[PDB]
Each structure stands twice: as structure tokens, then as C-alpha cells.
Ligand SMILES: CC(=O)N[C@@H]1[C@@H](O)[C@H](O)[C@@H](CO)O[C@H]1O
């Protein structure tokens with residue numbers, strides 16, 4: 001299992017992409033490596049990368065390479081997210097896709113070519129880099145197609161599947177030959193939102209690894225309590241849930257983002273949330289890695305962020321180590337060698353003829369399946385999660401080593417909140 | 425006398441060069457504009473780069489604007505800066521803190537007015553010590569964001585729009601007068617042609633130091649009357665003369681801040697004549713502050729989603745060579761560097777409410793009765809000006825403007841006006 005942090009540049013956040021202070025970035029990545037992390041995740045801005053649909057900015061590509069270079073010289077593997085897209089409640093969409101040029105990145109064919117050219121351009125610029133570990137198509141891109149988005153980019157579930165297949169397929173074989181990974185990222189709506197065009201099986205079958213972003217402001221922390229077994233184990237629950245919709249029985253699961261948000265978790269307890277959540281993740285088999293959010297706190301001078309976003313960094317505004325920064329550093333040591341035994345008792349999830357849930361609000365906070373797992377795990381049963389389709393096929397049940405099943409009737413939860421802050 | 429300049433579109437990477445300016449090319453760019461006979465340039469920083477967060481202005485972006493002003497001055501050109509873009513050639517550049525999850529109106533959101541206030545002062549503060557910094561415009565055609573046609577409209581009533589203009593202009597207005605610079609604001613022709621538009625005609629002609637007007641004959645004039653009609657060729661002069669009626673100062677200068685020969689309505693073979701005869705029409709109107717053509721350098725062929733006609737608007741080709749219109753504009757600078765315009769004596773009355781605004785704005789719009797009454801008067805060689813009904817009942821203002829003849833016409837709405845450059849935007 002791997003340990004890393006999502007890199008928020010100190011001093012100027014992602015606005016530093018306009019004019020990177022490379023000596024500060026070098027000091028930033030050196031601090032992350034000093035925690036014991038082995039990798040880092042970085043976020044270029046789509047508006048700077050591709051200011052026109054048919055012109056990618058060479059300076060922005062070169063600046064991404066420099067950060068990849070500096071990350072490696074600190075001893076860190078660097079994972080790059082291509083399309084931002086969305087970052088901490090803000091949207092950075094190039095001018096050729098807004099207002100007079102409004103379009104859907106998921107259905108507009110010429111916009112798919114632009115995303116296609118940018119993905120190849122990012123990989124081509126970094127192909128020679130030894131620390132270039134892999135690509136994610138973009139941070140939580142599905143938020144653009146959800147109905148909660150104030151400028152939704154429309155798309156049905158089939159178009160979303162073709163969207164993933166097009167971009168992932170461009171660089172999938174280069175990634176395999178080169179020894180790198182290609183993956184995609186979605187917020188918890190893919191697991192929790194009924195009617196969502198991103199289906200759970202997309203995250204667990206498309207791409208090389210399943211990415212998961214565990215945030216307990218989604219309803220789990222207010223419904224059950226900031227440090228309930230439901231909340232502290234939410235990251236583990238997302239790990240075990242995602243496996244049910246995967247075809248590969250030992251597919252790695254990467255918790256690509258997880259933090260202790262101040263809006264539901266208190267600062268005095270935030271270190272305990274870090275340690276125990278990682279204890280929960282460390283008990284699940286086949287975890288690719290744990291990437292914390294985030295590296296360095298957002299400067300106090302920047303505005304319109306949700307308040308809790310300013311304290312998410314592992315290093316404070318003056319560069320000193322945070323209380324959670326000591327918890328994440330100590331957790332890296334505690335779990336660098338811990339291996340997780342196979343999980344024997346599975347929770348059955350009733351699913352479509354094609355692998356999709358009947359009622360996703362039952363896997364959502366407050367739902368029966370959600371609570372059945374938390375209750376089973378709380379009692380030390382280390383449960384996994386299976387679908388109804390796999391439950392009637394002894395081959396897959398054998399490959400995964402399940403010997404005990406659990407049927408639970410579906411009751412919808414109502415605690416899920418699709419937005420970080422009430423203002424949205 | 426009147427000034428001649430060019431709107432500066434950076435060659436090679438358009439306004440995308442702001443991401444990483446090639447200063448040696450920009451230096452060569454401004455050298456070409458000066459060689460035409462131009463005395464000034466209008467430059468356009470991008471709001472998304474200037475102010476990536478509501479409470480943080482990027483020092484690198486401020487310094488890049490300063491370097492461009494410096495290169496313009498070392499080229500011998502006065503530099504006019506537009507603060508808020510905003511809108512440029514059918515594209516919107518709105519920062520992330522004013523979009524989607526942070527959607528807001530730049531005209532009514534108090535914190536967005538403070539942010540625009542900080543950027544306006546920062547731009548002026550950064551450039552105040554520089555000799556070639558000639559003045560500020562609040563932004564290129566900012567009214568298009570509040571128009572009812574806008575797909576992401578930032579709403580505002582006419583009273584709120586007045587407060588927006590009064591807040592930003594008043595910030596640097598007193599500094600501008602002692603420092604010897606001008607402060608102004610810009611609106612597209614919807615302020616003159618669109619009924620119900622929250623930007624009123626008297627805003628453009630009373631607020632700021634000079635009246636700005638952007639003359640584009642794809643607004644319906646070239647399609648209705650013909651690309652090389654007197655309605656089309658005199659549209660810029662008509663926009664000058666129309667704006668004066670709503671001005672309180674009888675000799676306030678009018679700045680045709682942008683004018684081009686758009687290829688979607690004018691044929692390339694005719695664009696040089698359109699340049700010459702339109703500037704001839706402007707040169708005959710009194711108190712023309714200047715004529716600023718659009719634009720300097722054509723957009724490179726590789727850039728996409730522009731309306732096709734935009735690629736050929738530049739005075740210099742993609743390889744730096746001068747276009748036929750570039751030779752027409754250069755020839756016009758020489759032809760009218762010394763020509764002064766006699767007073768215009770015959771005025772057209774604009775029926776107006778009790779508070780200075782037209783009864784029917786669509787009647788001065790293309791296809792309207794006031795519009796054609798002036799075009800017909802100008803076609804007959806009568807050199808007409810434009811007055812309001814209120815000024816017609818005040819012999820002092822008529823005396824101050826030297827008017828001796830009136831021409832009253834009934835209000836008939838036009839139906840030729842087009843609020844968008846391309847059919848794709850309807
Ligand atoms: C507009 C908004 O609230 N966006 C947030 C996003 O920043 C966050 O990464 C995600 C985590 O689940 O939750 C979304 O609601």
C-alpha cells in the first residue's frame with residue numbers, strides 16, 4: 001500500500017500556475033517527502049492548459065513537467081490529473097465551452113477531441129519522466145453532469161461510458177507498456193446519487209484502478225456523528241463497496257482523496273479521524289494507496305472558499321506541521337507493512353441485469369445497506385460487499401473467497417448531501 | 425483634430441499570449457502599429473489572469489500589463505488599457521469566483537463591485553508612473569453581460585447599472601484629471617439600439633470623460649441596407665452624431681473606440697474602401713476624439729470557434745505583412761491628420777422621456793425612422809446632427825451647438841437590428 005498527499009501549492013494555491021515560484025514548490029515537495037509519503041498528486045488548470053479548443057499552451061505543459069521533475073527529485077512519484085475542471089468548489093472551464101460557446105464535455109464531439117488532444121499532450125510531455133507514475137482524467141469530473149450543478153453539462157449513462165472509454169483508451173496501452181496507470185475520478189455521487197449518469201461499475205471496471213474520494217461531510221458525519229463507526233469507517237466502506245461492481249476480483253482500490261473536514265469534524269479530533277480512518281482502510285485488502293487532502297493549507301487571503309477548506313492542509317500557512325500532519329506521518333509508519341487478510345462475509349447489494357443498483361439511496365448514508373456494513377464491521381466482522389448477480393455464481397464467489405452472505409431489504413437513506421457547503 | 429490608433433491583438437497567440445508573453449514579438453507588434461501612423465493603441469488584459477481569486481490580484485499579471493505599456497511607449501504609442509475582460513471577440517473570460525457554484529452579478533453583487541474596484545485601482549496604480557499610460561476604459565463592452573440575450577446573464581436594472589458606472593469611474597476619476605489621463609467606459613451598440621436594455625444612451629454620453637462607440641455593420645445595417653450603402657458606410661459617423669444628443673456637454677469628444685470591416689457582411693474586395701469612406705464620414709463630424717481600428721494582427725489560422733469573419737479583421741496578416749485594409753487605414757491617417765470638421769447645423773430630433781432617454785430606442789436602430797432620417801439626410805449632403813426633444817425646447821443648448829434647422833420624424837420601430845455577430849449565438 002502506498003501513501004501520498006494531494007499537492008496544494010503553498011502560498012498561492014493553484015493560482016501559482018500563472019507564475020510558479022519553483023523554489024517554493026521545491027520546498028513544498030521536499031516537505032511532503034519528509035512526511036514519509038512516496039507519491040504526490042498534482043492538478044494543472046484546464047483554462048491555462050487549453051485556452052483555445054485547438055491550441056494547447058506549451059508553457060503550461062512545460063510547467064507541469066517542471067513540477068513532475070521537482071516531485072521526482074524529492075523522491076516522490078507524481079500522479080497528474082489532466083482536466084480541472086473542478087477543484088475545491090471552483091470551476092475552471094475554458095472560454096470555448098462557456099456562455100456563447102456553452103457545450104457538454106461529455107457529448108460535444110469537438111470538445112471530446114480537445115479533451116483527447118490534451119490527454120495525449122499531457123502524457124507526451126511527461127512520457128520521458130521517471131517519476132511520472134500515472135494519469136487521472138480529472139478530479140471528480142462527474143460533478144459537471146449532475147443535476148445539482150448550476151451549469152450542468154448534459155449526458156446519459158451511455159454517453160458517460162463512451163466518454164470514459166474514449167479518453168482512457170487513448171493512452172491505456174502506452175500506460176501498460178510504459179509501466180504507468182490510467183484512471184478516472186468521481187465524487188461519491190457515483191455510489192450515492194440515483195439517476196446519476198456515472199454508474200458504480202464505471203469506477204470499478206474502467207481504468208486500471210478504482211479511485212475513491214472519502215468525505216464525511218456528504219451526510220455521514222452529520223447523521224451518525226463526526227467520529228461514529230459509520231464516519232471513521234467511511235473510507236473503508238467506500239473501498240469495500242466499490243469491489244462489488246468490479247469484474248476483477250483483486251482489482252486494487254485507491255482512496256485518491258480523503259480529509260478531515262472542519263465542518264463536520266472538529267480540529268481537536270481531526271488527528272484521531274486521520275489515524276483511525278487509515279486503520280479502517282489498512283484492514284481492507286487490495287488497497288492501492290492512501291492520498292490525503294491536502295498538502296499545504298490555503299492562504300488566509302484567498303476568499304469564497306468554504307471555511308473548512310482552509311484548514312485541510314497537512315502543513316500550516318507558515319510551513320509548520322499540523323496535528324493531522326503528525327497523524328498522517330505516524331500512520332504511514334504504522335501501516336507501511338500491514339497486510340489485510342481476505343474478507344469472508346459479504347453484503348449482498350440487489351442490482352440490475354447489468355450490474356447497477358436498484359436503489360442507490362440504500363448504499364447512501366442513512367440506507368440499510370450502508371448501515372448493514374457499518375454495523376457488521378463495528379462488531380469486528382470485517383465484511384465485504386457483493387452484488388446480487390455475483391451472489392448467484394459460485395465461480396466469482398470462489399475467486400474472492402466469500403463463504404458467508406447477507407441479504408438485507410432495501411430502505412432508502414436520506415442523509416446524503418451532494419454539495420460541500422450549504423451555500424451551494 | 426483626432427487621434428488614430430489600433431486595438432492591439434497580439435500576433436501568434438492572440439490574447440492567449442498573456443499566459444506567457446513573447447516580449448520580442450510584442451515589441452515587434454507595437455513597432456508595426458506605430459509604423460502605420462498610429463499614435464495610440466488599446467490593449468486588453470484578461471480578467472481571469474488578473475484576478476484569479478476575488479481577494480487576490482496577481483502581481484505577475486499586473487507587471488505584464490506594465491511591460492506592454494512600456495513597449496508601447498518605447499514604440500512611440502500612447503497606451504489605453506481596458507480593465508475588465510470580460511468579453512472579447514465572442515468569448516467570455518469570467519473568473520472562477522463568479523461562475524457556476526459561485527455565480528454572481530458583477531453589477532449588483534457588492535463583493536464583486538469591491539473586487540472590480542480593487543482591480544481598477546491596481547491597474548491605475550501599477551501604470552500611474554508611466555508616461556505612455558494615456559487612460560483607462562472599465563472594460564470592452566461590459567453591457568453584453570447584462571443583456572437579455574446573454575446565456576449567463578448577470579442581471580441589473582438601469583438604476584443599478586448607473587451605480588456600477590458611478591462606483592468604478594469615481595474611483596480614479598479625480599486622479600485621472602490631475603494626472604492628465606482619461607477614464608471611460610464601453611458598451612456595444614445595444615445601449616443605442618435595444619429597447620429595455622439596462623444601459624441607457626445617456627450613460628455613454630455623460631459618464632466618463634469621452635463617449636465610446638463601437639461601429640460594426642453586421643448589427644443589421646449591412647444585411648438590411650447593403651455592405652456599401654450610405655447606411656453602412658456612415659454608421660460610425662451616425663453613431664458619433666447620435667451619441668451627442670444624449671450628452672450634456674455640447675462639445676464632449678466622441679471616441680470611435682472600435683471599428684472594422686467584418687467579412688460576414690462586407691466582401692474582402694470592398695473592405696479597403698469601407699475603411700476609407702467610413703473614416704471620411706467620421707472625419708466630417710465635429711469633436712471626434714479619435715478613431716481606433718479593429719484590429720492590429722489577424723488571429724492565427726490554428727485557433728478555432730471564432731466566427732469565421734474574425735480571422736481576417738486584422739490590419740496585419742499572420743506573417744506580419746500589411747493587408748489591403750492595413751494600407752487603407754494607413755492612407756486614412758495621412759488623409760485626415762489635419763482635417764477639421766465644420767459645425768453640423770441641421771439636427772434630427774429624438775423623441776425622449778422627461779429624463780433624457782428615448783421613447784422608442786428601436787426607432788434609432790437599423791430599420792427605424794430616426795436611423796433612416798439621418799442616413800437619408802446625410803446621403804443628401806446635409807451633414808446632419810442629432811438632438812433630443814428636450815434640447816429642442818431650450819434655445820440656449822441649440823445656440824451652444826449652433827443648430828439652425830430641425831427635422832422631426834414619427835417613431836417607427838426598426839426590425840433589422842442583430843445583437844450578435846454570428847448566427848450561432850442566437
Ligand atoms: C460544489 C461542491 O460542493 N463541490 C464539492 C467538491 O469540492 C468536493 O470535492 C466533493 C467531495 O464529495 O463534494 C462536492 O460537493
Ligand SMILES: CC(=O)N[C@@H]1[C@@H](O)[C@H](O)[C@@H](CO)O[C@H]1O
Pocket residue numbers: 100512513514515565612613638640842843844845846849
Ligand atoms: C456574442 C456576440 O457575437 N457578441 C458580439 C461581440 O463579440 C462584439 O464585440 C460586438 C460588437 O458590437 O457585437 C456583439 O454582438
